[PDB]
Amino acid sequence: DKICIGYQSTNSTETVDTLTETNVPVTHAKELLHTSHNGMLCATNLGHPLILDTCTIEGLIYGNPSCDLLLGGREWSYIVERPSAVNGMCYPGNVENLEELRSLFSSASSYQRIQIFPDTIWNVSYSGTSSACSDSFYRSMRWLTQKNNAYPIQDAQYTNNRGKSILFMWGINHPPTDTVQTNLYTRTDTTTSVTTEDINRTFKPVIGPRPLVNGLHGRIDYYWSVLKPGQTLRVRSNGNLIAPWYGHILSGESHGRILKTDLNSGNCVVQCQTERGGLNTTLPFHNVSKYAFGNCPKYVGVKSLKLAVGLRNVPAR
């Protein structure tokens, strides 16, 4: 008669690694790394993403005439700029501090337009347009030009009483010739100033032909700033100014991401979203992407993190 102490053995093919040995057979193990995603762009706990398929963020902000669908304002969890989004600044020119602008914008979770300067306040023409801009112009600004061969000094003011910051835009036109400069502003030497209690910016035109872009030799330098609650914006110009028309009230905080992909979007909701797809899991890690955002596990760059649960699996035979 005898009594023996022993331990379990199974047909498990699970293995785990240790520092002093690898591929140790174990009776039970738990994979801690989640490696699957749904291959789609979905909504997160913060809502649906703002998917821009024809307009770039700055195109929307400046109101490129091809982005009218966005005029009513939106709210988002995150932003997606499809590679097809090519409508940004239709009229040749650059946006100063573009990265900061796009960052500031994407960080909010919504925008709502607000009129700063009504068309009536001007004593000069305000409906200038361009073929580079669908024979129209930006919905955020007005291309001021002479009326009746006169361009009196323009001096307008707007006080932010919305109790919320207003993102506003403006530009300075640089005609390709002195003739065009005069035909539009009545003078070759102008001065434009955009000011508030904090900023004090002034601009002067520099006539001359730049390389062709969208068929034009001229340019418009684009600028932006933020009128804080209570502050007063004031613009004075005797020519060359592309006046603020509508601004945006930014609110909330989103995931603050800008994904640049053509990944398919679907009618879905996930805890964690990445540019490759989303996922749901209770496992502590994942290897889908370091850019994951939302309610996520910790990203780790490996194929597996198998934790031993049972004991070393030793075959009797």
């Binding site: 379990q8 174990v26 738990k30 801690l32 573009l98 490996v302 934790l307 070393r312 030793v314």
Partner: protein
């Protein structure tokens, strides 16, 4: 291994032990049979279940990396940002991998010790009423029927 029982002096496992990790196999006139030891098995299950939960709880916190845009003249800022991201990733990946490798060793050794402790507990109870065959069994010097066997398993063996 560290405690010398599993894949040690008790050379192999038992495919017949279906209820738990550790158990007993007896041999008397009435036949042979094995069953898991509930006490030791349940205690081990709670321990490892806790370790898993604490690991999951301690390591499931995400870190955020935003793919910021940089201008042509922000190449230095761009590199500094990449450095941060790369090290955040390398450090956490290292912590994750090492925690698992190191804990896996401890888990395996703990199962080994639990077997070793069960064996020594029985050795003590039996006293000189049995001899070790050196393979995990105790050759009893007296006949021991199922009821006797049960006293050994439930720790009430008389003549300890």
């Amino acid at each position: 291994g560290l405690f010398g029982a599993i894949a040690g002096f008790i050379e192999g496992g038992w495919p017949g032990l279906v209820a738990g990790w550790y158990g007993f196999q007896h041999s008397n006139d009435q036949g042979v049979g094995m069953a898991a030891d509930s006490d030791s098995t349940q205690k081990a299950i709670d321990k490892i279940t806790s370790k898993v939960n604490n690991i999951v709880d301690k390591m499931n916190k995400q870190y955020g990396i935003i793919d910021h845009e940089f201008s042509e003249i922000e190449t230095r800022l761009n590199m500094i940002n990449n450095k941060i991201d790369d090290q955040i990733q390398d450090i956490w990946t290292y912590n994750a991998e090492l925690l698992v490798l190191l804990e896996n060793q401890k888990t395996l050794d703990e199962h080994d010790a639990n077997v070793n402790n069960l064996y020594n507990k029985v050795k003590r109870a039996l006293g000189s009423n049995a001899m070790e065959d050196g393979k995990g069994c105790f050759e009893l010097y007296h006949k021991c029927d199922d009821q006797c066997m049960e006293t050994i398993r439930n720790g009430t063996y008389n003549r300890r």
